């Protein structure tokens, strides 16, 4: 039983728009912050790579559905490119070509018995909105509402699963370095917190919008996808345990405390540590933005499920390090990784499958067992079809998740593997491979071909169990 998926559990795979679509300026699409980064700052990206073509999924979406059907995916999670739909960011102009494209993908999926799951924002902000300051500027909350309305109106008759934002803990860091993630702004400890504040407001506006304008007719569900690493105490001390709790609150709780708790607001430890640090460093005002009581009430409860993006673990010990000001410094933990853990092609990603089970339990206890949909989980290598490391990564993580479900009572309701295919890996370009399908980026046809991991995942999806040969 511990090796069998619940009957209603949904299995599939996932992608993101900039990572796969290409057609970056085709048929009216406007520029986004990733177009800007890869065009203006190729020195920030391995090989000077761009997403101009990527997997060419704008043209090849039927091939994506074909491989999803082969895989036996029940669900496909993909994102919508804001600037493909609203080229100016604001809702004054709707690009029919973008409407047609996503309709064509949705219809193709449904005709092949695959459910669409749509992420509204996976990091590709229209440049016109970044030029107002981007996420640190609260005006973007209403702009996000208006974007979401166009999506609900056009697609919500057929799309019943939505995520507002993907991994805002990661994308907020685009406001914490001059050479980092788009838009590559150096405001650590100040602008990144403002970005988070706006995103939380935006998410809440989108959820209320669904309630007010769409839910009764459409009957779908709206969540948010949060990334989080497990943080294991470096030793069993109370002090090291405290540092790991700090980590969870500063990374997951930053977003999840305002939305998923009865109390709402940011975690107390976040408010208190930033307040103290700001005062000590001479600021009149805390660097952490504040919610009013009315905003706290508006934001709390804005969820039908929790999306989780899980990859890895860190070790945490008591202490403070990092630059002043920064979120890492404010968090009051010293982070390392254990040399013994298996590696990947990504410096940040080590294989720690039991950390997945620990994280799922932490979430269950902190948020009163919300329905959890694993929206990303996956592994990098440098290439190859005989991807034994990736096969092991998936079979172990899925076993740990199934223990969380069956042994620990965690309400996990679905899982989409990251990623369906090798794609543009952000600042790493095409150098790191996360796909279960390989893609030849030197071949203009961008053929997708199954790796061993795709064959193993198909077997899991078909049999609805972990095969015997992968069991402990
Ligand atoms: O692009 C791969 C994957 O990255 C995720 O972010 C990583 C980040 O790169 C790393 O520095 C940090 O320690 O861990 C996070 C994951 O928690 C991002 O969240 C994913 O959405 C993305 O697909
Ligand atoms: Cl066997
Ligand atoms: Na419209």
CSV table of C-alpha atoms and ligand atoms in Angstrom, one decimal:
chain,number,residue,atom,x,y,z
A,1,UNK,CA,0.0,0.0,0.0
A,2,UNK,CA,2.8,2.4,0.8
A,3,UNK,CA,3.9,2.0,-2.8
A,4,UNK,CA,0.5,2.7,-4.5
A,5,UNK,CA,-0.8,6.1,-5.5
A,6,UNK,CA,-4.3,7.1,-4.2
A,7,UNK,CA,-7.0,6.6,-6.8
A,8,UNK,CA,-7.7,10.3,-7.3
A,9,UNK,CA,-4.0,11.4,-7.1
A,10,UNK,CA,-3.0,13.3,-10.3
A,11,UNK,CA,0.4,12.6,-12.0
A,12,UNK,CA,2.0,14.6,-14.8
A,13,UNK,CA,4.8,16.9,-15.9
A,14,UNK,CA,5.5,20.6,-16.0
A,15,UNK,CA,7.1,23.5,-18.0
A,16,UNK,CA,7.3,27.3,-18.0
A,17,UNK,CA,6.7,29.7,-20.9
A,18,UNK,CA,10.1,31.5,-21.3
A,19,UNK,CA,11.9,28.2,-20.8
A,20,UNK,CA,10.2,26.4,-23.7
A,21,UNK,CA,8.2,28.6,-26.1
A,22,UNK,CA,10.6,30.7,-28.2
A,23,UNK,CA,8.8,32.9,-30.7
A,24,UNK,CA,9.9,35.8,-28.4
A,25,UNK,CA,8.7,38.6,-30.7
A,26,UNK,CA,6.4,36.7,-33.0
A,27,UNK,CA,2.8,37.7,-33.8
A,28,UNK,CA,2.6,40.7,-31.5
A,29,UNK,CA,4.2,39.3,-28.4
A,30,UNK,CA,5.8,42.1,-26.3
A,31,UNK,CA,9.1,42.0,-24.6
A,32,UNK,CA,9.6,40.7,-21.1
A,33,UNK,CA,12.4,41.0,-18.5
A,34,UNK,CA,14.0,37.7,-19.7
A,35,UNK,CA,14.1,39.0,-23.3
A,36,UNK,CA,15.8,42.1,-21.9
A,37,UNK,CA,18.3,40.1,-19.7
A,38,UNK,CA,19.4,37.7,-22.4
A,39,UNK,CA,19.6,40.4,-25.1
A,40,UNK,CA,21.3,43.1,-23.1
A,41,UNK,CA,23.3,41.1,-20.6
A,42,UNK,CA,24.5,37.9,-22.3
A,43,UNK,CA,27.5,38.0,-19.9
A,44,UNK,CA,25.0,37.0,-17.1
A,45,UNK,CA,24.1,33.7,-18.9
A,46,UNK,CA,26.2,30.6,-19.5
A,47,UNK,CA,27.2,30.5,-23.2
A,48,UNK,CA,25.3,33.8,-23.7
A,49,UNK,CA,22.2,31.7,-24.4
A,50,UNK,CA,18.8,33.1,-24.9
A,51,UNK,CA,15.2,31.9,-24.9
A,52,UNK,CA,14.6,33.3,-28.4
A,53,UNK,CA,13.8,29.8,-29.7
A,54,UNK,CA,14.3,27.4,-26.7
A,55,UNK,CA,12.2,24.3,-27.4
A,56,UNK,CA,10.1,26.2,-30.0
A,57,UNK,CA,6.9,25.1,-28.1
A,58,UNK,CA,5.1,28.1,-29.6
A,59,UNK,CA,5.2,26.2,-32.9
A,60,UNK,CA,5.6,22.7,-31.6
A,61,UNK,CA,2.9,22.5,-28.9
A,62,UNK,CA,1.3,19.5,-30.7
A,63,UNK,CA,4.6,17.6,-30.2
A,64,UNK,CA,4.5,18.5,-26.5
A,65,UNK,CA,1.0,17.0,-26.2
A,66,UNK,CA,2.1,13.9,-28.2
A,67,UNK,CA,4.9,13.2,-25.7
A,68,UNK,CA,2.6,13.9,-22.7
A,69,UNK,CA,0.2,11.3,-24.2
A,70,UNK,CA,3.1,8.8,-24.6
A,71,UNK,CA,4.1,9.5,-21.0
A,72,UNK,CA,0.5,8.9,-19.8
A,73,UNK,CA,0.4,12.2,-18.0
A,74,UNK,CA,-3.0,13.0,-16.4
A,75,UNK,CA,-2.1,16.7,-16.0
A,76,UNK,CA,0.2,19.1,-17.8
A,77,UNK,CA,1.3,22.2,-15.8
A,78,UNK,CA,2.4,25.0,-18.1
A,79,UNK,CA,2.7,28.8,-17.7
A,80,UNK,CA,1.2,31.7,-19.7
A,81,UNK,CA,3.5,34.4,-21.0
A,82,UNK,CA,2.0,37.7,-19.8
A,83,UNK,CA,3.5,39.7,-22.6
A,84,UNK,CA,2.3,37.2,-25.2
A,85,UNK,CA,-1.3,37.9,-24.0
A,86,UNK,CA,-1.0,41.6,-23.0
A,87,UNK,CA,2.0,42.9,-24.9
A,88,UNK,CA,2.0,46.3,-23.1
A,89,UNK,CA,1.5,44.6,-19.7
A,90,UNK,CA,-1.6,46.7,-19.0
A,91,UNK,CA,-4.9,45.3,-20.2
A,92,UNK,CA,-5.6,47.9,-22.9
A,93,UNK,CA,-4.4,45.6,-25.7
A,94,UNK,CA,-5.2,41.8,-25.8
A,95,UNK,CA,-3.1,40.0,-28.4
A,96,UNK,CA,-5.5,37.6,-30.2
A,97,UNK,CA,-2.5,35.5,-31.4
A,98,UNK,CA,-1.6,34.7,-27.7
A,99,UNK,CA,-5.3,33.9,-26.9
A,100,UNK,CA,-5.4,31.6,-29.9
A,101,UNK,CA,-2.1,29.9,-29.0
A,102,UNK,CA,-3.1,29.0,-25.4
A,103,UNK,CA,-6.6,28.0,-26.6
A,104,UNK,CA,-4.9,25.7,-29.1
A,105,UNK,CA,-2.7,24.1,-26.5
A,106,UNK,CA,-5.6,23.7,-24.0
A,107,UNK,CA,-7.9,22.2,-26.7
A,108,UNK,CA,-5.1,19.8,-27.9
A,109,UNK,CA,-4.5,18.6,-24.3
A,110,UNK,CA,-8.2,18.0,-23.6
A,111,UNK,CA,-8.7,16.2,-27.0
A,112,UNK,CA,-5.9,13.8,-25.8
A,113,UNK,CA,-7.4,13.3,-22.3
A,114,UNK,CA,-4.8,15.5,-20.4
A,115,UNK,CA,-6.0,18.1,-17.9
A,116,UNK,CA,-4.4,21.6,-18.2
A,117,UNK,CA,-3.0,23.2,-15.0
A,118,UNK,CA,-2.1,26.9,-15.6
A,119,UNK,CA,0.5,29.0,-13.9
A,120,UNK,CA,-0.2,32.7,-14.5
A,121,UNK,CA,3.3,34.0,-13.6
A,122,UNK,CA,6.5,32.1,-14.0
A,123,UNK,CA,9.0,34.9,-14.0
A,124,UNK,CA,8.4,36.6,-17.4
A,125,UNK,CA,7.2,40.1,-16.4
A,126,UNK,CA,6.4,42.5,-19.3
A,127,UNK,CA,9.3,45.0,-19.6
A,128,UNK,CA,6.7,47.9,-19.6
A,129,UNK,CA,5.8,46.9,-16.0
A,130,UNK,CA,9.4,46.5,-14.9
A,131,UNK,CA,10.0,50.0,-16.2
A,132,UNK,CA,7.7,51.3,-13.4
A,133,UNK,CA,10.0,49.4,-10.9
A,134,UNK,CA,8.5,45.9,-11.3
A,135,UNK,CA,7.5,43.9,-8.3
A,136,UNK,CA,8.7,46.4,-5.6
A,137,UNK,CA,6.0,48.8,-7.0
A,138,UNK,CA,2.6,47.9,-5.4
A,139,UNK,CA,0.8,49.2,-8.5
A,140,UNK,CA,1.6,45.8,-10.0
A,141,UNK,CA,-1.0,44.1,-7.7
A,142,UNK,CA,-3.9,45.7,-9.7
A,143,UNK,CA,-2.1,45.1,-13.0
A,144,UNK,CA,-1.9,41.4,-12.0
A,145,UNK,CA,-5.6,41.3,-11.2
A,146,UNK,CA,-6.4,42.6,-14.6
A,147,UNK,CA,-4.1,40.1,-16.3
A,148,UNK,CA,-5.8,37.3,-14.3
A,149,UNK,CA,-9.2,38.5,-15.5
A,150,UNK,CA,-8.2,38.1,-19.1
A,151,UNK,CA,-7.0,34.5,-18.3
A,152,UNK,CA,-10.1,33.5,-16.4
A,153,UNK,CA,-12.4,35.0,-19.1
A,154,UNK,CA,-10.7,33.4,-22.0
A,155,UNK,CA,-9.6,30.0,-20.6
A,156,UNK,CA,-11.5,29.3,-17.4
A,157,UNK,CA,-14.3,27.4,-19.1
A,158,UNK,CA,-11.8,24.6,-19.7
A,159,UNK,CA,-9.0,25.3,-17.1
A,160,UNK,CA,-10.0,24.2,-13.6
A,161,UNK,CA,-6.6,24.3,-11.9
A,162,UNK,CA,-4.7,27.6,-11.5
A,163,UNK,CA,-1.5,28.8,-9.8
A,164,UNK,CA,-1.1,32.6,-9.5
A,165,UNK,CA,2.7,32.7,-8.9
A,166,UNK,CA,5.5,30.2,-9.2
A,167,UNK,CA,8.5,30.3,-6.8
A,168,UNK,CA,8.3,33.9,-5.7
A,169,UNK,CA,11.0,33.2,-3.1
A,170,UNK,CA,13.3,32.7,-6.1
A,171,UNK,CA,12.1,35.4,-8.4
A,172,UNK,CA,12.2,38.1,-5.7
A,173,UNK,CA,15.9,37.5,-5.7
A,174,UNK,CA,15.9,39.3,-9.1
A,175,UNK,CA,15.8,42.4,-6.9
A,176,UNK,CA,18.8,41.3,-4.8
A,177,UNK,CA,21.7,41.3,-7.2
A,178,UNK,CA,23.0,43.4,-10.1
A,179,UNK,CA,24.1,40.2,-12.1
A,180,UNK,CA,21.4,37.8,-11.1
A,181,UNK,CA,17.9,36.7,-12.2
A,182,UNK,CA,15.9,39.2,-14.2
A,183,UNK,CA,15.5,42.1,-13.7
A,184,UNK,CA,19.0,42.0,-12.1
A,185,UNK,CA,18.5,44.8,-9.6
A,186,UNK,CA,20.8,45.2,-6.7
A,187,UNK,CA,18.4,46.0,-3.7
A,188,UNK,CA,19.0,43.1,-1.3
A,189,UNK,CA,17.2,43.3,2.0
A,190,UNK,CA,15.0,46.2,0.7
A,191,UNK,CA,13.6,45.7,-2.8
A,192,UNK,CA,13.3,41.9,-2.6
A,193,UNK,CA,11.0,42.4,0.5
A,194,UNK,CA,9.0,45.0,-1.4
A,195,UNK,CA,8.6,42.5,-4.3
A,196,UNK,CA,7.3,39.8,-2.0
A,197,UNK,CA,4.8,42.3,-0.5
A,198,UNK,CA,3.4,43.1,-3.9
A,199,UNK,CA,3.3,39.5,-5.0
A,200,UNK,CA,1.3,38.6,-1.8
A,201,UNK,CA,-1.1,41.4,-2.5
A,202,UNK,CA,-1.4,40.4,-6.1
A,203,UNK,CA,-2.1,36.8,-5.3
A,204,UNK,CA,-4.9,37.8,-2.9
A,205,UNK,CA,-6.4,40.1,-5.5
A,206,UNK,CA,-6.4,37.3,-8.0
A,207,UNK,CA,-8.1,34.9,-5.6
A,208,UNK,CA,-10.8,37.4,-4.6
A,209,UNK,CA,-11.3,38.1,-8.4
A,210,UNK,CA,-11.9,34.4,-9.0
A,211,UNK,CA,-14.4,34.3,-6.1
A,212,UNK,CA,-16.3,37.4,-7.3
A,213,UNK,CA,-16.3,37.1,-11.1
A,214,UNK,CA,-15.7,33.4,-12.1
A,215,UNK,CA,-15.9,30.6,-9.4
A,216,UNK,CA,-19.7,30.1,-9.5
A,217,UNK,CA,-19.7,29.5,-13.3
A,218,UNK,CA,-16.3,27.8,-13.7
A,219,UNK,CA,-16.0,25.7,-10.5
A,220,UNK,CA,-12.1,25.5,-10.5
A,221,UNK,CA,-9.4,25.9,-7.9
A,222,UNK,CA,-6.8,28.6,-7.4
A,223,UNK,CA,-3.5,28.1,-5.5
A,224,UNK,CA,0.1,29.4,-5.4
A,225,UNK,CA,3.3,27.5,-5.9
A,226,UNK,CA,6.0,28.0,-3.3
A,227,UNK,CA,9.5,26.7,-3.4
A,228,UNK,CA,11.2,25.5,-0.3
A,229,UNK,CA,14.4,23.6,0.6
A,230,UNK,CA,14.4,21.3,3.7
A,231,UNK,CA,16.8,22.7,6.3
A,232,UNK,CA,18.3,20.0,8.5
A,233,UNK,CA,19.9,20.9,11.8
A,234,UNK,CA,23.7,20.6,11.5
A,235,UNK,CA,23.7,19.1,15.0
A,236,UNK,CA,20.8,18.0,17.4
A,237,UNK,CA,21.1,21.2,19.5
A,238,UNK,CA,18.1,23.3,20.4
A,239,UNK,CA,20.1,26.3,18.9
A,240,UNK,CA,20.5,24.6,15.5
A,241,UNK,CA,16.9,23.5,15.5
A,242,UNK,CA,15.9,27.2,16.1
A,243,UNK,CA,18.0,28.2,13.1
A,244,UNK,CA,16.2,25.7,10.9
A,245,UNK,CA,12.8,27.0,12.1
A,246,UNK,CA,14.1,30.5,11.2
A,247,UNK,CA,14.9,29.1,7.7
A,248,UNK,CA,11.4,27.7,7.2
A,249,UNK,CA,9.8,30.9,8.3
A,250,UNK,CA,12.1,33.2,6.2
A,251,UNK,CA,11.7,31.1,3.1
A,252,UNK,CA,8.3,29.4,3.1
A,253,UNK,CA,6.6,31.3,5.9
A,254,UNK,CA,7.3,34.7,4.2
A,255,UNK,CA,4.6,33.7,1.6
A,256,UNK,CA,2.7,31.0,3.4
A,257,UNK,CA,2.0,32.6,6.8
A,258,UNK,CA,0.0,35.5,5.3
A,259,UNK,CA,-2.1,33.2,3.1
A,260,UNK,CA,-2.4,29.7,4.7
A,261,UNK,CA,-2.7,30.4,8.5
A,262,UNK,CA,-5.7,31.5,10.4
A,263,UNK,CA,-3.7,34.4,11.8
A,264,UNK,CA,-2.3,35.7,8.6
A,265,UNK,CA,0.4,38.4,8.4
A,266,UNK,CA,4.1,37.6,8.1
A,267,UNK,CA,5.7,35.2,10.6
A,268,UNK,CA,6.5,37.0,13.9
A,269,UNK,CA,10.2,36.0,13.6
A,270,UNK,CA,10.4,37.7,10.2
A,271,UNK,CA,8.9,40.9,11.5
A,272,UNK,CA,10.9,40.9,14.7
A,273,UNK,CA,14.3,40.1,13.3
A,274,UNK,CA,14.1,42.6,10.4
A,275,UNK,CA,12.8,45.3,12.8
A,276,UNK,CA,15.7,44.8,15.2
A,277,UNK,CA,18.3,44.6,12.4
A,278,UNK,CA,16.9,47.7,10.8
A,279,UNK,CA,17.0,49.7,14.0
A,280,UNK,CA,20.6,48.5,14.8
A,281,UNK,CA,21.8,49.6,11.4
A,282,UNK,CA,20.3,53.1,11.8
A,283,UNK,CA,17.1,53.0,9.7
A,284,UNK,CA,14.2,55.1,10.9
A,285,UNK,CA,11.8,52.5,9.4
A,286,UNK,CA,12.0,48.7,9.3
A,287,UNK,CA,13.1,47.3,5.9
A,288,UNK,CA,10.2,44.9,6.1
A,289,UNK,CA,6.9,46.3,4.7
A,290,UNK,CA,3.8,46.1,6.8
A,291,UNK,CA,0.3,44.9,6.3
A,292,UNK,CA,-2.6,46.8,7.9
A,293,UNK,CA,-5.1,44.7,9.9
A,294,UNK,CA,-7.6,45.0,7.0
A,295,UNK,CA,-5.0,43.7,4.5
A,296,UNK,CA,-4.1,40.8,6.9
A,297,UNK,CA,-7.8,39.8,6.8
A,298,UNK,CA,-8.1,40.2,3.0
A,299,UNK,CA,-5.0,38.1,2.3
A,300,UNK,CA,-5.5,35.2,4.8
A,301,UNK,CA,-7.5,32.3,3.4
A,302,UNK,CA,-6.9,33.1,-0.3
A,303,UNK,CA,-6.3,29.5,-1.3
A,304,UNK,CA,-7.9,26.3,-2.6
A,305,UNK,CA,-4.6,24.3,-2.3
A,306,UNK,CA,-0.9,24.8,-1.8
A,307,UNK,CA,1.5,24.2,-4.7
A,308,UNK,CA,5.0,23.0,-3.6
A,309,UNK,CA,8.2,23.2,-5.6
A,310,UNK,CA,10.8,20.9,-3.9
A,311,UNK,CA,14.3,20.0,-5.0
A,312,UNK,CA,16.8,19.7,-2.2
A,313,UNK,CA,18.0,20.3,1.4
A,314,UNK,CA,20.6,22.3,3.3
A,315,UNK,CA,22.2,22.0,6.7
A,316,UNK,CA,21.5,24.9,9.1
A,317,UNK,CA,23.3,25.9,12.2
A,318,UNK,CA,22.9,28.7,14.7
A,319,UNK,CA,24.5,32.0,13.7
A,320,UNK,CA,24.3,34.9,11.3
A,321,UNK,CA,26.1,35.5,8.1
A,322,UNK,CA,25.7,37.3,4.8
A,323,UNK,CA,25.9,40.9,3.6
A,324,UNK,CA,24.2,43.8,5.4
A,325,UNK,CA,21.4,44.2,4.4
A,326,UNK,CA,20.1,40.9,3.0
A,327,UNK,CA,17.4,38.3,3.6
A,328,UNK,CA,20.0,35.6,4.3
A,329,UNK,CA,21.6,37.8,7.0
A,330,UNK,CA,18.2,38.7,8.5
A,331,UNK,CA,17.2,35.0,8.6
A,332,UNK,CA,19.7,34.0,11.4
A,333,UNK,CA,21.0,30.7,10.1
A,334,UNK,CA,24.3,29.6,8.7
A,335,UNK,CA,23.7,27.3,5.7
A,336,UNK,CA,25.9,24.6,4.2
A,337,UNK,CA,25.5,21.3,2.3
A,338,UNK,CA,26.8,17.9,3.3
A,339,UNK,CA,29.6,16.6,1.1
A,340,UNK,CA,28.2,13.1,1.4
A,341,UNK,CA,25.0,13.9,-0.5
A,342,UNK,CA,24.8,12.9,-4.1
A,343,UNK,CA,25.4,15.8,-6.5
A,344,UNK,CA,23.7,17.0,-9.7
A,345,UNK,CA,24.7,19.4,-12.5
A,346,UNK,CA,23.5,22.3,-10.4
A,347,UNK,CA,25.6,23.7,-7.6
A,348,UNK,CA,22.6,24.3,-5.4
A,349,UNK,CA,20.9,20.9,-5.9
A,350,UNK,CA,22.0,17.9,-3.9
A,351,UNK,CA,20.0,14.6,-3.7
A,352,UNK,CA,18.3,14.4,-0.2
A,353,UNK,CA,15.1,12.5,-0.7
A,354,UNK,CA,14.2,12.2,3.0
A,355,UNK,CA,14.2,16.0,3.2
A,356,UNK,CA,11.0,15.9,1.0
A,357,UNK,CA,9.2,13.8,3.6
A,358,UNK,CA,10.5,16.2,6.4
A,359,UNK,CA,9.3,19.2,4.5
A,360,UNK,CA,5.8,17.7,3.8
A,361,UNK,CA,5.5,17.1,7.5
A,362,UNK,CA,6.6,20.6,8.4
A,363,UNK,CA,3.9,22.0,6.1
A,364,UNK,CA,1.3,19.6,7.4
A,365,UNK,CA,1.9,20.8,11.0
A,366,UNK,CA,2.3,24.5,10.3
A,367,UNK,CA,-0.6,25.0,7.9
A,368,UNK,CA,-3.1,22.4,9.2
A,369,UNK,CA,-2.7,19.8,6.5
A,370,UNK,CA,-3.7,21.9,3.4
A,371,UNK,CA,-4.2,20.0,0.1
A,372,UNK,CA,-0.7,20.0,-1.4
A,373,UNK,CA,0.0,19.6,-5.2
A,374,UNK,CA,3.7,19.1,-5.9
A,375,UNK,CA,4.1,21.4,-8.9
A,376,UNK,CA,7.9,20.8,-9.4
A,377,UNK,CA,10.3,18.1,-8.4
A,378,UNK,CA,13.4,17.1,-10.6
A,379,UNK,CA,17.1,16.7,-11.1
A,380,UNK,CA,19.8,18.1,-13.4
A,381,UNK,CA,22.5,16.4,-15.4
A,382,UNK,CA,24.7,17.6,-18.3
A,383,UNK,CA,23.1,15.4,-20.9
A,384,UNK,CA,22.5,11.7,-21.8
A,385,UNK,CA,19.5,9.4,-22.3
A,386,UNK,CA,20.6,6.7,-19.8
A,387,UNK,CA,19.8,9.1,-16.9
A,388,UNK,CA,20.3,6.7,-14.0
A,389,UNK,CA,20.7,9.7,-11.6
A,390,UNK,CA,17.4,11.2,-12.6
A,391,UNK,CA,15.6,7.8,-12.4
A,392,UNK,CA,17.0,7.3,-8.8
A,393,UNK,CA,16.0,10.9,-8.0
A,394,UNK,CA,12.4,10.3,-9.1
A,395,UNK,CA,11.9,6.9,-7.6
A,396,UNK,CA,13.3,8.0,-4.2
A,397,UNK,CA,11.4,11.2,-4.1
A,398,UNK,CA,8.1,9.5,-5.0
A,399,UNK,CA,8.7,6.8,-2.4
A,400,UNK,CA,9.3,9.5,0.3
A,401,UNK,CA,6.1,11.4,-0.9
A,402,UNK,CA,4.1,8.1,-0.7
A,403,UNK,CA,5.4,7.6,2.9
A,404,UNK,CA,4.3,11.2,3.7
A,405,UNK,CA,0.8,10.3,2.3
A,406,UNK,CA,0.3,6.8,3.7
A,407,UNK,CA,2.4,6.8,6.9
A,408,UNK,CA,2.2,10.5,7.9
A,409,UNK,CA,-1.3,11.5,6.7
A,410,UNK,CA,-0.1,14.4,4.5
A,411,UNK,CA,-2.8,15.4,2.0
A,412,UNK,CA,-0.8,15.4,-1.2
A,413,UNK,CA,-3.1,15.5,-4.1
A,414,UNK,CA,-0.9,15.6,-7.2
A,415,UNK,CA,2.6,15.7,-8.6
A,416,UNK,CA,4.0,17.2,-11.8
A,417,UNK,CA,7.7,16.3,-12.7
A,418,UNK,CA,10.0,19.2,-13.5
A,419,UNK,CA,10.5,19.2,-16.4
A,420,UNK,CA,8.8,17.5,-19.4
A,421,UNK,CA,11.8,18.4,-21.5
A,422,UNK,CA,15.2,19.9,-21.4
A,423,UNK,CA,14.8,23.7,-21.7
A,424,UNK,CA,16.3,27.1,-21.1
A,425,UNK,CA,17.6,26.9,-17.6
A,426,UNK,CA,17.6,30.6,-16.8
A,427,UNK,CA,21.2,31.9,-16.1
A,428,UNK,CA,22.5,28.4,-16.8
A,429,UNK,CA,21.3,28.6,-20.4
A,430,UNK,CA,21.2,25.1,-22.1
A,431,UNK,CA,24.1,23.8,-20.0
A,432,UNK,CA,21.9,22.1,-17.3
A,433,UNK,CA,19.4,19.5,-18.3
A,434,UNK,CA,16.2,19.0,-16.2
A,435,UNK,CA,14.1,17.1,-18.8
A,436,UNK,CA,12.7,13.6,-18.8
A,437,UNK,CA,12.7,14.1,-22.6
A,438,UNK,CA,15.9,15.2,-24.3
A,439,UNK,CA,15.9,18.0,-26.8
A,440,UNK,CA,18.5,18.7,-29.5
A,441,UNK,CA,19.1,22.4,-29.4
A,442,UNK,CA,21.3,22.2,-32.5
A,443,UNK,CA,18.5,20.8,-34.6
A,444,UNK,CA,16.0,23.4,-35.8
A,445,UNK,CA,13.2,20.8,-35.5
A,446,UNK,CA,13.9,20.5,-31.7
A,447,UNK,CA,13.0,16.8,-31.6
A,448,UNK,CA,11.9,15.5,-28.1
A,449,UNK,CA,13.2,12.0,-27.3
A,450,UNK,CA,12.5,10.0,-24.1
A,451,UNK,CA,15.2,9.4,-21.6
A,452,UNK,CA,15.1,6.4,-19.3
A,453,UNK,CA,13.4,8.6,-16.7
A,454,UNK,CA,10.5,9.2,-19.1
A,455,UNK,CA,10.1,5.4,-19.5
A,456,UNK,CA,10.2,4.8,-15.8
A,457,UNK,CA,7.8,7.6,-15.1
A,458,UNK,CA,5.4,6.2,-17.8
A,459,UNK,CA,5.6,2.8,-16.0
A,460,UNK,CA,4.8,4.5,-12.7
A,461,UNK,CA,1.9,6.4,-14.3
A,462,UNK,CA,0.5,3.3,-16.0
A,463,UNK,CA,0.8,1.0,-13.1
A,464,UNK,CA,0.0,3.6,-10.4
A,465,UNK,CA,2.7,2.1,-8.2
A,466,UNK,CA,6.4,2.2,-7.6
A,467,UNK,CA,7.8,-0.9,-9.5
A,468,UNK,CA,9.2,-3.7,-7.3
A,469,UNK,CA,12.8,-3.2,-8.6
A,470,UNK,CA,12.9,0.3,-7.0
A,471,UNK,CA,11.5,-0.6,-3.6
A,472,UNK,CA,13.7,-0.7,-0.5
B,1,LIG,O1,15.5,26.5,-12.2
B,1,LIG,C1,15.5,25.3,-11.4
B,1,LIG,C2,14.5,25.7,-10.3
B,1,LIG,O2,15.2,26.6,-9.4
B,1,LIG,C3,14.5,26.8,-8.2
B,1,LIG,O3,15.3,27.7,-7.4
B,1,LIG,C4,16.3,27.1,-6.6
B,1,LIG,C5,17.5,28.1,-6.6
B,1,LIG,O4,18.1,28.1,-7.9
B,1,LIG,C6,18.5,27.8,-5.6
B,1,LIG,O5,19.5,28.9,-5.5
B,1,LIG,C7,17.8,27.7,-4.2
B,1,LIG,O6,18.7,27.3,-3.1
B,1,LIG,O7,16.8,26.7,-4.2
B,1,LIG,C8,15.8,27.0,-5.1
B,1,LIG,C9,14.7,25.9,-5.0
B,1,LIG,O8,14.1,26.0,-3.7
B,1,LIG,C10,13.2,27.5,-8.5
B,1,LIG,O9,12.5,27.7,-7.3
B,1,LIG,C11,12.4,26.5,-9.4
B,1,LIG,O10,11.1,27.1,-9.6
B,1,LIG,C12,13.2,26.3,-10.7
B,1,LIG,O11,12.5,25.5,-11.6
B,2,LIG,CL1,11.3,-6.6,-11.7
B,3,LIG,NA1,-10.2,39.5,-23.4
